[PDB]
């Protein structure tokens, strides 16, 4: 009841930043997490026992793929901790409550294959979710932790609240469902531009939960240069070993995904950063100024990758 969790100094001020990285001892995750949420939400918004007790199951239904894991669920947690701490009064406190465990949850048993591979290979689950096969997977994955015994964290919600979040929840991980982003980004676009958007409207705050999603998920292009450089690693690990399995049932993959095409990578992320990450932070920036810093840091990665392909690293 009086337990605080505290972070060692380095800590305690670098996770306040946006480029914080969570660092690679993974026992202390957890705890990161914990300081995040009562730090963002209270102290009371979770009885302790079940937040750690979900927190444990949650560990255990990520697998050890080499991105899609237990330290990308924390990172997004934390870009989406960052968010809300920078724009403390734009929120409510079901929203507080339910986006930390959105992102905690958001790739919830990722086997490391896109939605793509999933149709191709005519997995079960692409049978179950025609779209957004996964990520009908990962909330189906987060309501089934939640009713494990101990595991219900929103126990003291009302039944109405209850339903509101678990709304919000699915809302927030269906949104990263990066063939949604584009459109969702496009009308934040014109709603912004227009004027005519509008935070009471609840189709608006969806969208734009929406966008927040996708910035978080994508927050790997927002780290220090090594950080971004070495999770790229990570990511095309992930994305050739799709391509081999793509080989395998007989399709060549498309580029981004062919080990052959290693040699393209500095020209895949520019094309990455000016198709995706840098409209999503701009747009971003323009909605919630307090969230620039993302755009900063990504627009510095993008020129470290021009750099890159200059051969001047
Ligand atoms: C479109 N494209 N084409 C290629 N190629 C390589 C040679 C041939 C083409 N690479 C790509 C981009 C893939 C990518 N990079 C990143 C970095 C970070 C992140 C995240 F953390 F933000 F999510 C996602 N991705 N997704
Ligand atoms: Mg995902
Ligand atoms: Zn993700």
């Given at each position: 009841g009086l337990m605080q969790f505290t972070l060692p100094v380095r800590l305690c001020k670098e996770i306040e930043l946006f480029h914080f990285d969570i660092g690679p001892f993974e026992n202390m995750w957890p705890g990161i997490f914990v300081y995040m949420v009562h730090r963002?939400?209270?102290?009371?918004?979770?009885?302790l026992e079940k937040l750690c007790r979900f927190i444990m199951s949650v560990k255990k239904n990520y697998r050890r793929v080499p991105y899609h894991n237990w330290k990308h669920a924390v990172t997004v947690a934390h870009c989406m901790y960052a968010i809300l701490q920078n724009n403390?009064?734009?929120?409510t406190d079901l929203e507080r409550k339910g986006l930390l465990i959105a992102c905690l949850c958001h790739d919830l048993d990722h086997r490391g294959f896109s939605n793509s591979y999933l149709q191709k290979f005519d997995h079960p689950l692409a049978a179950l979710y025609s779209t957004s096969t996964m990520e009908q997977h990962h909330f189906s994955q987060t309501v089934s932790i939640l009713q494990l015994e101990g595991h219900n964290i929103f126990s003291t919600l009302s039944s109405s609240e209850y339903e509101q979040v678990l709304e919000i929840i699915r809302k927030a991980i269906i949104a990263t469902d990066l063939a949604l982003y584009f459109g969702n980004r496009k009308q934040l676009e014109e709603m912004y531009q227009t004027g005519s958007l509008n935070l009471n409207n609840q189709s608006h705050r969806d969208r734009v939960i929406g966008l927040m999603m996708t910035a978080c998920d994508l927050c790997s292009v927002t780290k220090l240069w090594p950080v971004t450089k070495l999770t790229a690693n990570d990511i095309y690990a992930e994305f050739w070993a799709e391509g081999d399995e793509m080989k395998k049932l007989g399709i060549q993959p498309i580029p981004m995904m062919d080990?052959?095409?290693?040699?393209e990578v500095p020209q895949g992320q520019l094309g990455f950063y000016n198709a995706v990450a840098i409209p999503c932070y701009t747009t971003l920036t323009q909605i919630?100024?307090?969230?620039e810093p993302l755009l900063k840091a990504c627009r510095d990665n993008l020129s470290q990758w021009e750099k890159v392909i200059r051969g001047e690293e």
């Amino acid at each position: 009841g009086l337990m605080q969790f505290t972070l060692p100094v380095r800590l305690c001020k670098e996770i306040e930043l946006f480029h914080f990285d969570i660092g690679p001892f993974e026992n202390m995750w957890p705890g990161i997490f914990v300081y995040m949420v009562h730090r963002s939400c209270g102290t009371s918004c979770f009885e302790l026992e079940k937040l750690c007790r979900f927190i444990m199951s949650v560990k255990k239904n990520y697998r050890r793929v080499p991105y899609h894991n237990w330290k990308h669920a924390v990172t997004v947690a934390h870009c989406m901790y960052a968010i809300l701490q920078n724009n403390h009064t734009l929120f409510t406190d079901l929203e507080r409550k339910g986006l930390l465990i959105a992102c905690l949850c958001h790739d919830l048993d990722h086997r490391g294959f896109s939605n793509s591979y999933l149709q191709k290979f005519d997995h079960p689950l692409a049978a179950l979710y025609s779209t957004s096969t996964m990520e009908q997977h990962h909330f189906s994955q987060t309501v089934s932790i939640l009713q494990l015994e101990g595991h219900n964290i929103f126990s003291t919600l009302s039944s109405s609240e209850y339903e509101q979040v678990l709304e919000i929840i699915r809302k927030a991980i269906i949104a990263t469902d990066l063939a949604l982003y584009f459109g969702n980004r496009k009308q934040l676009e014109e709603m912004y531009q227009t004027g005519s958007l509008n935070l009471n409207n609840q189709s608006h705050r969806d969208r734009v939960i929406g966008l927040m999603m996708t910035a978080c998920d994508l927050c790997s292009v927002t780290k220090l240069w090594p950080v971004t450089k070495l999770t790229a690693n990570d990511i095309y690990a992930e994305f050739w070993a799709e391509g081999d399995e793509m080989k395998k049932l007989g399709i060549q993959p498309i580029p981004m995904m062919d080990r052959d095409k290693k040699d393209e990578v500095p020209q895949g992320q520019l094309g990455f950063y000016n198709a995706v990450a840098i409209p999503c932070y701009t747009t971003l920036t323009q909605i919630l100024p307090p969230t620039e810093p993302l755009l900063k840091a990504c627009r510095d990665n993008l020129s470290q990758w021009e750099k890159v392909i200059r051969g001047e690293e």
